[PDB]
Design a protein around this ligand. Sequence first.
Ligand code: NA
Ligand code: NA
Ligand code: NA
Ligand code: NA
Ligand code: NA
Ligand code: NA
Lengths: 384, 384
Amino acid sequence: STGQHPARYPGAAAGEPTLDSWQEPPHNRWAFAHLGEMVPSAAVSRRPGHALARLGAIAAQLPDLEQRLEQTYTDAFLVLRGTEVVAEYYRAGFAPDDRHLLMSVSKSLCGTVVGALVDEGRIDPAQPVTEYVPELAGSVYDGPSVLQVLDMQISIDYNEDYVDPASEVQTHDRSAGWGTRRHGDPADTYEFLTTLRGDGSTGEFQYCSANTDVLAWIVERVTGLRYVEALSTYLWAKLDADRDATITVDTTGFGFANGGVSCTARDLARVGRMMLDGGVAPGGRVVSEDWVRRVLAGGSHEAMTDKGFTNTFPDGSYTRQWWCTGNERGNVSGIGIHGQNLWLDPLTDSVIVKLSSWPDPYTEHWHRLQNGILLDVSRALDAV
Amino acid sequence: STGQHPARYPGAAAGEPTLDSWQEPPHNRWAFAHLGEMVPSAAVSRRPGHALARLGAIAAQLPDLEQRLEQTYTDAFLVLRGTEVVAEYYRAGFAPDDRHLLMSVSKSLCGTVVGALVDEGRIDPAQPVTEYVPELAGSVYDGPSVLQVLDMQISIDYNEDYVDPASEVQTHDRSAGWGTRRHGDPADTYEFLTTLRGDGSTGEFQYCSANTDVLAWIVERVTGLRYVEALSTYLWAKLDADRDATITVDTTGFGFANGGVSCTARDLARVGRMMLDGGVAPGGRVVSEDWVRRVLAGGSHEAMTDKGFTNTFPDGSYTRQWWCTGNERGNVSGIGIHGQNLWLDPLTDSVIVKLSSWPDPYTEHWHRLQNGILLDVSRALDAV
Ligand code: NA
Ligand code: NA
Ligand code: NA
Ligand code: NA
Ligand code: NA
Ligand code: NA
């Protein structure tokens, strides 16, 4: 049993509607206005073939930048210097206002929502997860603090071999609706999280997507809002965004907080702008100045033992759902598989968004190419 | 075998991507920009509780109109007189720019796309369906003309008892992704259509949602476009709409043409405006003047033997995916279950959109209430 969850609509029974009940009363009043949350759906365009390259300023210092973007399967790229868009690129077939999947850049948005609730005193990071989600008793999440979930410092038996359908990584996706369910799968993401185990040790970084979904569960328990709604109220609706974001949902309506947000490149940059503005956005303060300062400061370096990160960034770390390079520029980034970054360059007051579609989720070589672009662009923005 | 279908993206193999392949190359470049077509997804609002009633002009003649709207589970209601919005109503919880499922009002949009292709000479309604979709040989659709599908004058063994999961009506929904598949179901909507049989007779109206999906299949064969795209290119992108429409898609990406479109009330009214403008919309001609005139003229009265319609409209008929009342005002309407109407009132140059969520798909009493509102509002717009 996974306990109480926010109803899909006011008055809804647990789990309702399902794919088999949404046409029935009382669900249909809600479902007829929200059917894409139940059934895959396509846009029918109101508007009736070529890459847009507006590299600006940086084009002089980086004359081969468009080629380097193509080589890293770039879909959308945008540089915000201060409040100004100073460079943009969109591949052929991807409009400037199209949305793109964020993959684990989504985690950095979830951490932001948690930080908002920490500022309000509704979450205390020193408390055990089970203070907020007692149904995680008996799992790997029984013992660790909320801060240890925020910093991903919990050892979890979570097989990352996605070729193997019995792996946790594939099971987590199927539980959330990203793949077709197999017999015996958990019914929804909450149930999947309660199956997770580990040896009980903490304090060493282990990147694991389940942690973010636990954070979103905590957000729901403390606010009584669907994660979809909390992500809007605590973050998205404060950005003065051009478009709504979207988030995939499982069969209970729970947003896939770790990986399923999509948004435009320009709107994602507004999240970075808020972080470089000390936590304030056009619609109000999102998170405290202290929370932003802790993100920029980094996590414990000794916890960071992922050589995929520290071979490039030897003084790197992770905190509060952000990767902290520890480099001489203090760069910090949200990162997601296949080449997604929300990269902060505080020295130049700039944000770089790069949304891509590498053929592979991760290789060392794609990361070397991608980080080389992000660092070159950051350096191109320095005063000279 | 259902033959060639438009690829989900340029170069895609048949059927790709699936829910299990969209993260793989080469699909992921498309899927990361279109993930709501693969996985149910929710809007994360960019904007941070009460009914809006702006009944205008008609409020004087119909002082209890808001109550009558509430009693018929109205979500959105809009009256367009000429080019002007003269009345609007939205229930608490439904914003003026929210989208609503159209149910079989979607059929009237599909018929419009067919009419556009008839005007271009790409579809000849006198030809057998099998001229365009030879894979429907051996089904109920082997023999009938395209016009007989447009006018729904084909006898088909199609059980409408939706409580029974073995009914055609439920099977059609599961085949398209509107319900959870059962063992032995067809894999997609095309395959479902090839299973349909009947006694071979034609010429009598039989309302059947499968007909519209056959029309959309024909549209794909003649244009090489996904129905989703044809609906945009031939209709939606010409309306100067405020928002995109959406359409549910099956696992091949085929739009559920008979029932799955959602759009705003104001944008739906633009379709009616185009019909009352002789087929022209702001972006260009949609359909010929002749096609509109035939819709307004009605179908063969003797084919119409549905007493659910003729008890109210004794001279009624159906043609080209529109219901023709044959009343003294010449009203014509798109209609969908649970109270959807795109109602044309040519005498007053007006369009009435009513989008609702009755608890039941159909009863005689809901239709009597709903038609009484639509006729009273139409009469309220006459010159006096
Ligand atoms: Na997966
Ligand atoms: Na500030
Ligand atoms: Na905070
Ligand atoms: Na159904
Ligand atoms: Na005209
Ligand atoms: Na025409």
